[PDB]
Amino acid sequence: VAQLTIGNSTITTQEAANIIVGYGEWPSYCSDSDATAVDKPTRPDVSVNRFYTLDTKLWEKSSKGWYWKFPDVLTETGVFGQNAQFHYLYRSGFCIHVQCNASKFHQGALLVAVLPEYVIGTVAGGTGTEDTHPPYKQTQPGADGFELQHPYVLDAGIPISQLTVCPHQWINLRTNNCATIIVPYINALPFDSALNHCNFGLLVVPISPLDYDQGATPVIPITITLAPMCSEFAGLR
Amino acid sequence: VAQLTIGNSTITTQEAANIIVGYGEWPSYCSDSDATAVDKPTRPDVSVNRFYTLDTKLWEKSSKGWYWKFPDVLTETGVFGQNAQFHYLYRSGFCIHVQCNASKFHQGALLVAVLPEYVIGTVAGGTGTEDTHPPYKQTQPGADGFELQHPYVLDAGIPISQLTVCPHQWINLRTNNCATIIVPYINALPFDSALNHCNFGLLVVPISPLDYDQGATPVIPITITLAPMCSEFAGLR
Amino acid sequence: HSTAETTLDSFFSRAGLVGEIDLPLKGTTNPNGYANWDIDITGYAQMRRKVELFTYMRFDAEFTFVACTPTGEVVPQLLQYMFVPPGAPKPDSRESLAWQTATNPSVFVKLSDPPAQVSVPFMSPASAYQWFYDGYPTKDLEYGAMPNNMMGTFSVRTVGTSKSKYPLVVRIYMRMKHVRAWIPRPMRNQNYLFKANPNYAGNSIKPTGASRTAITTL
Amino acid sequence: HSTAETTLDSFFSRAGLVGEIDLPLKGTTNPNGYANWDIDITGYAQMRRKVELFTYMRFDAEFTFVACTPTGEVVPQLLQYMFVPPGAPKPDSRESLAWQTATNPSVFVKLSDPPAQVSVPFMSPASAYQWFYDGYPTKDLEYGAMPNNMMGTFSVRTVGTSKSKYPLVVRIYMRMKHVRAWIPRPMRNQNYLFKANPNYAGNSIKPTGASRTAITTL
Amino acid sequence: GFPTELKPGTNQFLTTDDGVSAPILPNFHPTPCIHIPGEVRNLLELCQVETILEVNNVPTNATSLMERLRFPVSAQAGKGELCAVFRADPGRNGPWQSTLLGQLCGYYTQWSGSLEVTFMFTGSFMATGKMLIAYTPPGGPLPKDRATAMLGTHVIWDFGLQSSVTLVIPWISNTHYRAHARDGVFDYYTTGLVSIWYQTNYVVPIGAPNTAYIIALAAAQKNFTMKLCKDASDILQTG
Amino acid sequence: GFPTELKPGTNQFLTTDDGVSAPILPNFHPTPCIHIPGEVRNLLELCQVETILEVNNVPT
């Protein structure tokens, strides 16, 4: 055990569990011979790139699962949400860290994976004849996130049973509590909009339900801490 | 400031403003292995090639613009008009010099460009149903030149806004007053008729209108001085 | 010992049927002896789910045209197939000047002449066609709309000033070639409802596969 | 990073439609089952303005012939396409001996046979075709007339001593190849009135492009 | 003979197939190409040429069309006032239609590169003052006032010192597709904006006109490009 | 010309024949492929990935 720091942010975390570098690539920058070599894109290092610790969600027996969108989650938050908004283009890598705090008397298993272009699909009326498009509160939940309503198909008509095909990591209470994931910038373009397009979405679902005997804390706090890697911006407004 | 001379002609001009060598080529002669290697074409040097100073045109607030045709302008003038007429073929390069004389209290901007095969198009009746062909006084104005009547389309259905695509030079009263242009022989043939075909036309139009407060001279004299370069002729009559 | 068949190209080869034009004489259907077909590769049912296995893709398409009368008959009639690239205007009528715009590749062939066949490049202004877009283009109805995935339109019509003398049927096949794919994703396990979004039936949510009685009986 | 598409050749490729011959049975139009078409590259509307961007040009043309009946039908009829170079005499009748003058290239083909196709060279006795001529040939009606820009005539007719049994329609496409251009010039911003001169409507003189209210409002 | 199987596409006529055909006149030796000045090889040569941008594209009255070429500045305009504004939309309607660049964009579907506008003050030599020229990248709304525009990428222009000034537009990309009415148009959205404010007022001594005009000239950098030939025009050869 | 005899199969359309056809847009230079993470090349890559097996496939 030891604590790492990035500016004014200091998190207490375990030595170095197995990290998952999504798709074997490290969030790097973008060279000079690109599309916009004129408007030299300024890369934040100071405060912009540090440890943000989102409002902890409480695991319950009935919990269905949660998901956040990127970069949406932060475009609201602090000095990073500052850049994302008053800037024309954005490319950024991510270090995501998820941890639970539970006694050796709780049981559960959370799959935690990242899914590019996570496009939500609602119920469509029920009988299948209403072309209802997911709201804005469902498409970009912010930093509070949003709860799945049909985990089995990941609110989008895809088996979750196959989500492992994405950069994932498991959190089995009886073995580990913290899971870490490095995500590179993934998109069909070098740069893009930070407010219109959500390159990906963080998924965390209880595959084995939370359980405990009466008397033990009934809710397990899940704490998501995340940090931007090699983040770049272009065209101030 | 200094004065250059070519025979009996002596013009007082500024040291050496930026000259525009049209299309990056210098008015050169034509070698022996051509179409008429027999009738060795005599090249005038003596008087034929010197400084002609055309009847100065007076710039006004209402002025629409002026244009001359080549070699037409000179086929009337002096010993050069002598050769052009009593000779069968002609090829010649040109040094054109345009200058205004105005107090630092006048304002204006004249675009001065040269346009190959400048073919005049009249109004065509007005409603568009009369196939009226431009007169001879409009097609070959001589050394007095001729005034545009529809500058915007350069009396020919083409935007002037795009005339810069031709060898041009600007004359902004608050910066310069003299503009110079070197023109090479341009035609689909080595030689041609000096009285039937006008290889090009000199254009000079007020893009920013002449202006001044009451009391300052109301007309700005524009003086065109020009000199033939590597001019050749063949077949005397 | 060989695994050539499990490659992407192997998986996506084969020219499948993705389009069918009807040009009846008397009819409610395409009354002006012409038709416009915006290129949809979902035209081959089976397709959608196969491609939706990946997030991004790239490829070229080989189009082969099969034309005959409804009974599959061959007749002396000439035809014009026009490809209007994306951004180019499709013909609104059987005499639209679009039919003559050089910038719209067109190919002519007699029904007798064997199938027409041409290759079409990777259009998209983006680096890859992307089946999923989690955003909107600068609650909405523009969600999941990556337009830069348009391949273009195919306009078909009988040659000549007058309607054709025969009822015609064109079939469009498409072989995908030179394929590259990125970011694999969960195989659609629910039925598709719309051509645009991934929406499903929230009542009829079925288990990925066949169920059984007990977990101790086979 | 590549700029192959912005080249001259790229810009002027594509075989466009520049001609259409009608050979009806009963008609006021071409009553003698034959027709003469002096080669006009302005035949493709869009063309004129594109070429008139340059003062001089040079190129070869590939001609492709498409023939059918008005409904775009194919029939067992043979045809003669005759190219009469400039300076050669065009046929005044359906039996003019010009049709048999060896010095007039001719090509025969059945309607069934696929399109006829030939290349025609840079004719002009001058070093280049020139779209603008500021003079007269040794107020006049001969102004702007550079005749040495003639490519020739194309004479078409049904083979045989007698009129054809079918109504026919020939279409002529032309791809320009090996292009070279000189002295660029202002893009025509006014409507064309005549095929010969640049004359425009002196009443209807319109601003090059869309106007707006104030120079402070968008 | 030699065994062969004909493949689909046999006997077809592709209007874009650049194969070879038989020469009608095999013996003909076409008159030799001689040297002619200013040969153009690739259109992008033209796109890099400065053409007059009709920013003042407001008068339509036939005899005032020459006015579109130049807009003016005067004493009457107070400090801070917005002189003029326009977008960085080469291919779309408006100002750019006058430039040669604009007209060439029309024969193409897509494009991208850095642009470059140059302003020329044509007023009396005795006049002086400052103009603030600001660029608001795509998305950023036209700055409320001079001061807010002062915080953006701007340039203070003192035509008392230099009669010309050139602004560079870092980037513009007509790549985002749009299928509005039922007619699909690969449109901008990158409508970068160029505002121009009177930093100071127009100052002049007795004897000099209290108004002067300015000329906009635009062209694209060497990094410009275009894709998808698309012939389109309102002007065509009449019957 | 050059002597030839056409063999059976001439003029046929095989939905699996991977020959070449004429490019509709000869001058077009398609936007360059840039680097994108996790490219798949052969499906068997996917087959070696651990997926959840619904052994308890009983509740519906």
TrEMBL record, chains A, B:
Subunit structure: Capsid protein VP1: Interacts with capsid protein VP0, and capsid protein VP3 to form heterotrimeric protomers. Five protomers subsequently associate to form pentamers which serve as building blocks for the capsid. Interacts with capsid protein VP2, capsid protein VP3 and capsid protein VP4 following cleavage of capsid protein VP0.
Protein name: Genome polyprotein
Biological source species: Human enterovirus 71
Family according to the record: Belongs to the picornaviruses polyprotein family.
Compartment(s): Host cytoplasmic vesicle membrane; Host nucleus; Virion
Role summary: Capsid protein VP0: Component of immature procapsids, which is cleaved into capsid proteins VP4 and VP2 after maturation. Allows the capsid to remain inactive before the maturation step. Capsid protein VP4: Lies on the inner surface of the capsid shell. After binding to the host receptor, the capsid undergoes conformational changes. Capsid protein VP4 is released, Capsid protein VP1 N-terminus is externalized, and together, they shape a pore in the host membrane through which the viral genome is translocated into the host cell cytoplasm.
Covered range of the whole protein: 82 to 318 of 2193
TrEMBL record, chains C, D:
Record-annotated membrane-spanning stretches: none
Highest taxon, organism lineage: Viruses
Localization terms from the record: Host cytoplasmic vesicle membrane; Host nucleus; Virion
Family of the protein in this entry: Belongs to the picornaviruses polyprotein family.
Job of this protein: Capsid protein VP0: Component of immature procapsids, which is cleaved into capsid proteins VP4 and VP2 after maturation. Allows the capsid to remain inactive before the maturation step.
Subunit note: Capsid protein VP1: Interacts with capsid protein VP0, and capsid protein VP3 to form heterotrimeric protomers. Five protomers subsequently associate to form pentamers which serve as building blocks for the capsid. Interacts with capsid protein VP2, capsid protein VP3 and capsid protein VP4 following cleavage of capsid protein VP0. Homodimer. Interacts with host GBF1. Interacts (via GOLD domain) with host ACBD3 (via GOLD domain); this interaction allows the formation of a viral protein 3A/ACBD3 heterotetramer with a 2:2 stoichiometry, which will stimulate the recruitment of host PI4KB in order to synthesize PI4P at the viral RNA replication sites.
Name used for this protein in its record: Genome polyprotein
Organism: Human enterovirus 71
